[PDB]
Amino acid sequence: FTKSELKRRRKTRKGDGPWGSWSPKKVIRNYPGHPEGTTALKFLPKTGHLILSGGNDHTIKIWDFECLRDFQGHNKPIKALRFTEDCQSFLSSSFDRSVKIWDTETGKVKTRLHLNSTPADVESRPTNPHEFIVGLSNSKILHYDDVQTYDHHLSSILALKYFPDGSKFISSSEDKTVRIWENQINVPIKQISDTASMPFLNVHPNYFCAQSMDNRIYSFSKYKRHPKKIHSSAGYGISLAFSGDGRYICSGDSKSRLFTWDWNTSRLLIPGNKPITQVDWHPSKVICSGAAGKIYVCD
């Protein structure tokens, strides 16, 4: 062999010398940048490339999963935000008594839906029908043609979801009930009273729902909880997140009911301001807007 032959020959190995080849949860990131509280968070259902985060400052700040853009246009705080699958649309809803559409392409308000009596605290986008489901202090659920009004709970309606088969709308109210709706006939299919206000629900990506209350997180086709009082999010791995108002993050297994972890966030540079307002998982990461004016990303 020859020196030239070897010198030329080696560079073939991938990485210099000599290793070059021949041939629980925790807190990843803290994002400040809202002026007010962070009320609601939703994530791009297709590419996972960004957030849409409401605020208490009326804005919406679209974060890269850096801050991309700002969407203004509500006069009052934004309680809920939901992004569409089949559509490039973004439906935001606030305390101003209005459900505003957003065309993601050109970033301008398209449509305003009218006729709530008062602030509208939940929007959920029916998967296959091109419908909107809105609800709020009205104490009624309005099915919007992107038509139906659902008479119902005896108090405000905190959290609403949509499902492709029967009951197509699940609803949760401060009368401490959860109704499973039949929309075509327009009346309650089933009532679930076992809660002693139900402030949050989440749909398992098993065809069930996880319902919340002060001290007891149940499921519906139990979860062990000491007082956690007072959002939920369901990973595709059957992990069930529970945000506290005491600042504790209560993680569960969904099958069992077992609680395998409880964390405590660091407030910020008041001890009352430490809590978790909303939360979501991507399409292995967790995103929680907190009352301290920060979004946190748990890995």
């Binding site: 062990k224 069992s256 009911r257 077992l258």
Partner: protein, 95 residues
Amino acid sequence: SRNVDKANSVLVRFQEQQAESAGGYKDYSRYQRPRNVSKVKSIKEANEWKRQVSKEIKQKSTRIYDPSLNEMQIAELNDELNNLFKEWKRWQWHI
């Protein structure tokens, strides 16, 4: 004191009450019937309650043919059999 005392103490029970919530222990070698059938729960459970009967069916069934000669005794034991076998019927019917 006979271990009848020692197995029923609080320090024995509490870990069973944790194993029910944290996993699939809790036996069924402990509890009794439960008296009513239709009040039982999801099938994967009554499944074990049912064998918790059939086993005694086997024990006393073997205890039938024994020559040991007590005819009154095997009479009451015979009625106990019939009772249990009826229970077995009931647990099957619920399933």
